[PDB]
């Protein structure tokens, strides 16, 4: 029940915002407030050709 990483820094008031490769999630949006998504990043599978 303790957040680490950038989300942990933001929720525990150690930072004002978390600029980076932060994916919008259900739980993260429950905990912190996200801005509009500025790049679409789902989950995808990479394989050797």
């Amino acid at each position: 029940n303790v957040w680490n990483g950038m989300i942990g820094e933001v929720v525990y008031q150690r930072a004002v915002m978390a600029v980076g490769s932060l994916t919008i999630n259900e739980e993260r949006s429950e905990v912190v407030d996200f801005s509009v998504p500025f790049v679409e990043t789902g989950i995808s599978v990479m394989v050797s050709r």
Binding site: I24, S29, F34, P37, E40
Partner: protein, 49 residues
């Protein structure tokens, strides 16, 4: 939060190709067809001459 990610794009009419009946005679200009037809026969008569 967006429920569908998309963007602007251009829709155009896909040209359906039309097949002319003279398509196989198209590679050679009509004067070339006439010239080769004349050449065949002049060579043919000159063989037996």
């Amino acid at each position: 939060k967006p429920f569908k990610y998309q963007g602007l794009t251009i829709l155009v009419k896909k040209e359906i190709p039309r097949s002319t009946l003279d398509s196989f005679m198209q590679p050679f200009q009509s004067t070339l067809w006439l010239l080769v037809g004349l050449s065949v026969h002049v060579v043919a008569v000159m063989l037996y001459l």
